[PDB]
Design a protein around this ligand. Sequence first.
Ligand SMILES: CCCC[P+](CCCC)(CCCC)CCCC
Ligand SMILES: CCCC[P+](CCCC)(CCCC)CCCC
Lengths: 14, 372, 7
Amino acid sequence: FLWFYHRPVRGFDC
Amino acid sequence: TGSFNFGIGYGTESGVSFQAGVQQDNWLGTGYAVGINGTKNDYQTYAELSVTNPYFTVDGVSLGGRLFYNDFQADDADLSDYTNKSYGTDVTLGFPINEYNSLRAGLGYVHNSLSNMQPQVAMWRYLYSMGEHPSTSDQDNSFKTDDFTFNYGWTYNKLDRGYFPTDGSRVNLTGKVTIPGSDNEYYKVTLDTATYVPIDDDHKWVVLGRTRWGYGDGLGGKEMPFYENFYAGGSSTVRGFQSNTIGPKAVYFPHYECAAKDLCKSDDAVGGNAMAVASLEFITPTPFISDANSVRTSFFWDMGTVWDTNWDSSQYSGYPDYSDPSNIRMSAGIALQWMSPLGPLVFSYAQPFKKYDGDKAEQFQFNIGKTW
Amino acid sequence: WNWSKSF
Ligand SMILES: CCCC[P+](CCCC)(CCCC)CCCC
Ligand SMILES: CCCC[P+](CCCC)(CCCC)CCCC
């Protein structure tokens, strides 16, 4: 939702 | 007119990440942008076709549809081992509510194909809830589901600027629920918040408060599938902890290995159906440099926990109680962000000064370019 | 890094 925080593990809808 | 692209990024969460796509706005004059994209990193390969009309109505209600497939290798994600090859499709209406708020509603179909699951308690407890009874003594297994979901989203964005924000907040709420007819039966909700409060008039001194919340559970006697678990730990969540280390750890059956005539504790993370992260971060002027407005320096305090609400302690009194939400991990550290010529760059060094058994440390973390 | 070229 915001760089660089809370990158999904199962990408890639961030 | 259209374009193509390719990209490379690198980070401790993902390793090397490769992106490539072709895109065309207003494809064949339909009013729909059409994209075909793929991304690959150490543990995942994903491709999709998207078809998107941002002005499905003249008011900027958007309609998007996608097809995708995914290959996920859990062991390369620092999890207990399984393979999940999936594919599906979704359709999403995007509603602009006002300057600061948008909503999303969507339907999704997904086919999950699980194989190569190393037998472990939490995973098998899910499988059993599904009426499935694979052997506990080998990795030769297969488990397939077909789910239909209602997908909803709310984004609140009132940041002063997107590049190094100094003021305002961003909130993202995502939910989904299976629709009758699905194999799985569960709901899942995620909430991300970031709030920036500037201290000085020049906004060079900024307090960031960041949270993350995840809760999902089965409806009826079914559990949320493990392949939808939340994780924490890593360069973007709780710094100083190895990717995905925080929370329950696999309890393997006789078959880190357990290859042994008893159940075997491990330090392989499996995630959980509940998760919470909070972080306080003080942004300060970058020391021993001057201009200074292209770098952001900060000190932070990171905390997080992950748990398994269906972990059955009474049966497994001899093991850590993975249903306990109160094993809060904490780290302190420093971070730097910079728009490098290789693309957006973040570096952090952080010490995990509160951890639990099996948790793994990763003091130095970074991410360069797109890894998302 | 990301390289992008139109046609
Ligand atoms: C590239 C042209 C896209 C056309 P649409 C549907 C095509 C059917 C095969 C896109 C739907 C996205 C979910 C539009 C339908 C209007 C109601
Ligand atoms: C500096 C911004 C702090 C924002 P909050 C506190 C986050 C803890 C790290 C709320 C503070 C109220 C006074 C988080 C609101 C969403 C749960």
